[PDB]
Design a protein around this ligand. Structure first.
Ligand SMILES: Nc1ncnc2c1ncn2[C@@H]1O[C@H](COP(=O)(O)OP(=O)(O)OC[C@H]2OC[C@H](F)[C@@H]2O)[C@@H](O)[C@H]1O
Ligand SMILES: Nc1ncnc2c1ncn2[C@@H]1O[C@H](COP(=O)(O)OP(=O)(O)OC[C@H]2OC[C@H](F)[C@@H]2O)[C@@H](O)[C@H]1O
Lengths: 251, 251
């Protein structure tokens, strides 16, 4: 598994591009400059083994890179990357973690530390499914925590209700692991959206299975709660890509 | 009207980002590296009056930055930015000019030359509707040329059929000015999509008004031709944002 080339340069460019042109009316600017940000990013992991990370290792970075988030516009998701991001619409409808400075810079990149100069490895990185969990999930876990923690108002969660193997809510998804338990008293409610892929067997439903569990969980947190399956706005997205599925017929 | 801060740095960062992470399986990489590209970009307009540009001013730069384009996947649009780009889905379904390197680096930026050091203006740029047409359209017109020119196979064109003021096809839209007339013999056909916004009065149709004109024009070019109005795929898109409009009712 191959590390991202010229990591430092890509990091600093994405960062500059963002600072100056992206989500301008949508997210506030961060306060550290780019080489400030990088410094902290690099320190987290450099000069150690790949597997020598825990959940505190990028604490400082996410401290500098955190942005306050628009009221009611935070979204979360599980097993629906494409559809959740299509529906969120680059910040226009909702904010996803991928829209925030740190999510945007780091999205899709592969890196790791090595003890020998230059402190990081340009040939290879280990699966990470070979590392302890706290390493494996050092970065994106802390990312999700910082994210979830700075959410205010209403939040929305999109899930996949068409999976026999993976339930809609699972307490060891990133959502259940780092996102849900980190929400603060500033959050008032959790709107849930259950995606039911077209053509494919329906598995989870509001008020049953895991979603019954999540419901209870959320209520305990002193949050409101609602849940809907394939609301029209979402339904049409799906259909857009599959306009013949039996679910898409016109009046 | 305010020029983009730190132009150079944004350009170079957007450029590195693309070079290394964007459209990897969709567009080929460019050959010039980034400060090569920037040199040609800068040369084109620096140390001259904003108003001192013609159509050849960024010829070199688009020579360097041009990429060969997927067969049949090239799209054009007029007056439907949002909808066309949604439908194109970041290159997955079609390629828009905005997905190419040059389009991507420069998208949305504001800059202009000045004669006194440092060559360009960091306070203000005149409202280009004060310049001769060839200046006003120096950059994006050339950009559309080089793009249109590099198209092969089938091409698609999306138009707005719901506008009393602006007809669906106009010979002075960038499409009719730089794109259409620059299509080469490698192109075989033009698929046209007429958007009919929901709730709003229908104006143009296939085989009438400017679309009759465009049709004939396209036939003279020895290209095939078809045209549809709100195909389902597109229809659901619109509907996604406006799920109550009469047009959107379910069986
Ligand atoms: N740091 C990360 N952030 C987002 N996605 C990630 C991250 N790391 C890996 N992934 C992908 O997510 C899958 C892991 O499970 P999943 O995506 O099916 O659902 P989870 O609740 O587990 O994570 C997504 C939530 O956490 C934060 C977001 F804002 C969502 O609300 C893997 O296959 C990866 O493609
Ligand atoms: N949201 C936006 N973001 C950035 N620029 C925009 C936006 N909306 C309009 N514009 C600009 O407003 C001017 C008038 O656009 P038009 O829509 O009248 O169609 P044209 O055929 O003249 O030009 C679009 C075609 O040319 C090159 C492509 F391949 C299309 O097939 C355009 O140059 C747009 O860049």
């Amino acid at each position: 598994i191959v590390p991202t080339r010229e990591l430092e340069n890509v990091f600093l460019g994405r960062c500059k591009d963002y600072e100056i042109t992206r989500y301008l009316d949508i997210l506030p600017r961060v306060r550290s400059d780019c080489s400030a940000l990088w410094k902290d990013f690099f320190k987290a992991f450099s000069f150690k083994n790949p597997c020598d990370l825990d959940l505190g290792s990028y604490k400082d970075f996410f401290t500098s890179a955190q942005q306050q988030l628009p009221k009611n516009k935070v979204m979360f998701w599980s097993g629906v990357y494409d559809e959740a991001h299509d529906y969120a619409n680059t910040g226009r409808k909702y904010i996803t973690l991928e829209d925030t400075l740190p999510g945007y810079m780091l999205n899709s990149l592969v890196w790791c530390g090595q003890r020998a100069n230059p402190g990081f490895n340009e040939k290879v990185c280990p699966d990470f499914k070979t590392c302890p969990v706290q390493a494996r999930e050092s970065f994106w876990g802390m990312a999700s925590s910082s994210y979830a923690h700075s959410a205010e108002g209403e939040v929305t969660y999109m899930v996949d209700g068409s999976n026999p193997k993976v339930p809609a809510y699972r307490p060891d998804s990133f959502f259940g692991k780092y996102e849900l338990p980190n929400l603060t008293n500033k959050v008032t409610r959790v709107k849930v959206i259950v995606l039911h892929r077209l053509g494919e067997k329906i598995i989870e439903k509001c008020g049953a299975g895991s979603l019954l569990d999540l419901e209870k969980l959320v209520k305990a947190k002193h949050f409101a709660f609602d849940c809907v399956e394939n609301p029209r706005a979402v339904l049409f997205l799906l259909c857009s890509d599959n306009p013949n599925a039996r679910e898409c017929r016109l009046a």
